[PDB]
Design a protein around this ligand. Structure first.
Ligand SMILES: [Mg+2]
Ligand SMILES: [Mg+2]
Lengths: 106, 397
RNA sequence: GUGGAGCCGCCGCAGGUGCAGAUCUUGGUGGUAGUAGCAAAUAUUCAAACGAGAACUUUGAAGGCCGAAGUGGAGAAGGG
RNA sequence: GUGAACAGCCUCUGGCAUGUUGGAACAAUGUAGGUAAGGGAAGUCGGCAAGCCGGAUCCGUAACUUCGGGAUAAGGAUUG
RNA sequence: AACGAGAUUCCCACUGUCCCUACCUACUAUCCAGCGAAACCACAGCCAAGGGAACGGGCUUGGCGGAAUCAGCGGGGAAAG
RNA sequence: AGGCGGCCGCCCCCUCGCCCGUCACGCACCGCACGUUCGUGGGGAACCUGGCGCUAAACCAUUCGUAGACGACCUGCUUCUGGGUCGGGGUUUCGUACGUAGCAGAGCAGCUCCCUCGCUGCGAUCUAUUGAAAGUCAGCCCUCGACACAAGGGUUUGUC
């Protein structure tokens, strides 16, 4: 039940592969969800709108090969589910992915 | 009636239940039948194929046009770390066949045998053979464990050896040893049993079992191709283009009056992943892999008398989908049953032969270790950056 | 045992007088079977809101199609 | 916009949610679209089907003829 | 002569029509959530021979004969219409 | 298909463990069937019950991709040679990135030091940086650099 926040590179080129042209960027957002419900640990994965714009910025079938995201574990409120934590995955733009590894922002 | 044009059967009816085999490890259906006049030895050995390369050799063959010339040959290589003997089995001959008399396992058993005795090593309490190892040490169990050898010596007449592989020395993921059960073909059954009491829980290398330019069998499970149709599983001819409801089908599958489809007809199902035995594969080289650290790591594989270059048989870029061979190997002329990383059991041939292709001495001249992960054109990393020169790789000093 | 207002024996009388069939007539129910199927015209995604409840509603954002002989704007017959 | 063009293809105004469902997988057989070494009708009742050729500019065009044609004959060269 | 979505024969060019097949793509088939029919049906459903309305699934004599099922398949049901 | 058998040493014990003869009684149930054995057979279920012993493993979920239509199959999941994600290398594919620099550039325009390489601008390309850039396991190879993560579940299974 932490409040931690890390940032990550997701190469989508490994993670959607052999997918047909019209199911290619829509899977690229449920593989970000499957990444984020694996690592922060909670099923309620939220992603913001400016990351939906980030993956879809080149049509469906040409997803950018790698994106830089950050995952924020936060807790919920107001007559909540038996899941009481949610993850906000928001989009951080960057210019180079070389020698960028999983750091822990505080 | 009477096809007007003769043509033979498609496919063989001797492999007819084209079925997924019930085993991943190839089963020796028949070890070589012995006489006790020979010295004592093993007959079979487990190995893992890594991939293929090719070779160049000065082939000696009088009469042929191949004589005294260089001729390339496809070769597979099989990574074989030494086995480790665990058990002794005894088989008594009956009028119903062989029957296991009893087994004796080793005094203390490795990690990777014990992992083969479970379906979930994680959830297990790791408890197999824990009460069996305590009859080697108590006074009462020890005198009736060596009584089970003296009763083995009296009655049963063919004895075998349970040995497993050392998966720790291998680049795979598996870490379960493959537990084989292989027949000793020595002299009398007292010397045949004392040769295995001497050497429980000890290593048996691959050069002790096989020899160079000697011809063996290969037993394994084939590449699995899945559920495939009539024209691919059975190589049946396609129908013409104009055919309604389909091209890749066999058209007639029987006459009227046998009112019943036959086993001899071709129809769709599982293709591949079948248990097969290739016969008469010649060993080209017994490898020795990555020895002592006095000279820090002598690679020295694939370095023939005509090469004299510090090479190693693992190709430039590594074996594709396999890893990197750090152990002993046996390389075999030609194609071999199985995917890469698949357990295949090498075995001395039953039949004797002369044939002038067996018993010939092969002397290598060249093994390429070029990149199989593309159209590679260099053979060592020293050779490339001599030709390629400096790059933008270092670019700091 | 259910049921809740009619019913039967004998002597005579009189028939629209007794079903297994007619690819019978009408009504009902199976098995096939949770099966065939819900595949013509490129495509959906994120967040939010109202709600017991959202792949489909709405709203914003992105990505697409029609592409002015239109999937646009109005009519005639027809509908009501 | 391209172009000879109310062709085709792409966009703006204006419309729409992919045409009575969604998810996962990517076996056979199919339906629809490609590609194939060497040979080039040997396939077949039959060159069926598919593929070649294709626009425009500069030349150059036979037999035959009802003198009109054939004729974009055929056969080349070029193209940013 | 000209013109034929007319019939035919040859030649050039071209090509998976063929030698001789192989691989890739979409939509399915396939599995799941929901929804869900119809033709058909004496009883049913493993064979060999015999006899028989002369070509049995049942009958005679033999062979033999384990639940429950899935994706296919086109021999049979002298399959359905 | 030994599951059965032989021998011996000590021991609570018998001295009738047989045949012939003597003496005399026990349900003699009053004519009657399923009597008499194997046998404290086999199987199941629980109770009162002394002693000696034992403290698991399957399947699902998750993972893998040597496997697969679906099931099935091959594997991983230790609190550190555990394997997962990023990063780095290796391998390889295509063919030299953007930007900057140029006395490279068919020429053309302007200005004036009217200027026989005067200067500047426009300009496909070309040269240098640049065997560069970009991709690379998703079913490539080696990593043990950095981040975490792991015992967290679910369903059942016993031999009078
Ligand atoms: Mg045998
Ligand atoms: Mg063949």
């Amino acid at each position: 039940n932490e409040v931690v926040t890390r940032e990550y590179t997701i190469n989508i080129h490994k993670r959607i592969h052999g997918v047909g042209f019209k199911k290619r960027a829509p899977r690229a957002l449920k593989e970000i969800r499957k990444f984020a419900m694996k690592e922060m640990g909670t099923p309620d994965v939220r992603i913001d709108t400016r990351l939906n714009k980030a993956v879809w910025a080149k049509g469906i079938r040409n997803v950018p090969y790698r994106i830089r995201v950050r995952l924020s574990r936060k807790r919920n409120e107001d007559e909540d589910s038996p899941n009481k934590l949610y993850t906000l995955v928001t989009y951080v733009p960057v210019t180079t992915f070389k020698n960028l590894q999983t750091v822990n922002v505080d | 009636s009477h096809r007007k044009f003769s043509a033979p059967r498609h496919g063989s009816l001797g492999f007819l239940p084209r079925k997924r085999s019930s085993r991943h490890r190839g089963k020796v259906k028949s070890f070589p039948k012995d006489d006790p006049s020979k010295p004592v030895h093993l007959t079979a050995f487990l190995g893992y194929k890594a991939g293929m390369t090719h070779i160049v050799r000065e082939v000696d063959r009088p009469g042929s046009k191949v004589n005294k010339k260089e001729v390339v040959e496809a070769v597979t290589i099989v990574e074989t770390p030494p086995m480790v003997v665990v058990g002794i089995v005894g088989y008594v001959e009956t009028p119903r066949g062989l029957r296991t008399f009893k087994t004796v396992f080793a005094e203390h058993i490795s990690d990777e045998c014990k992992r083969r005795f479970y379906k979930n090593w994680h959830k297990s309490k790791k408890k197999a053979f824990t009460k069996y190892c305590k009859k080697w040490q108590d006074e009462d169990g020890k005198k009736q464990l060596e009584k089970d050898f003296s009763s083995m010596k009296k009655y049963c007449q063919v004895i075998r050896v349970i040995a497993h592989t050392q998966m720790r020395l291998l680049p795979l993921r598996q870490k379960k040893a493959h537990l084989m059960e292989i027949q000793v073909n020595g002299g009398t059954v007292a010397e045949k049993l004392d040769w295995a009491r001497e050497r429980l829980e000890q290593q048996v290398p691959v050069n002790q079992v096989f020899g160079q330019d000697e011809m063996i069998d290969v037993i394994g499970v084939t590449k699995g191709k899945g559920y495939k149709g009539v024209t691919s599983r059975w190589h049946t001819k396609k129908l013409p283009r104009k055919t309604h409801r389909g091209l890749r089908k066999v058209a007639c599958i029987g006459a009227w009056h046998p009112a019943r489809v036959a086993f001899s007809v071709a129809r769709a199902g599982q293709k591949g992943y079948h248990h097969r035995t290739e016969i008469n594969k010649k060993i080209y080289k017994i490898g020795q892999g990555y020895l002592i650290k006095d000279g820090k790591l002598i690679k020295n594989n694939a370095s023939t008398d005509y090469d004299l270059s510090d090479k190693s048989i693992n190709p430039l870029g590594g074996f594709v989908h396999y890893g990197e061979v750090t152990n002993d190997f046996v390389m075999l002329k030609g194609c071999v049953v199985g995917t890469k990383k698949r357990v295949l059991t090498l075995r001395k041939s039953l039949l004797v032969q002369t044939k002038r292709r067996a018993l010939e001495k092969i002397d290598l001249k060249f093994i390429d270790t070029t990149s199989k992960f593309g159209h590679g054109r260099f053979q060592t990393m020293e050779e490339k950056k001599a030709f390629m020169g400096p790059l933008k790789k270092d670019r700091i000093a």
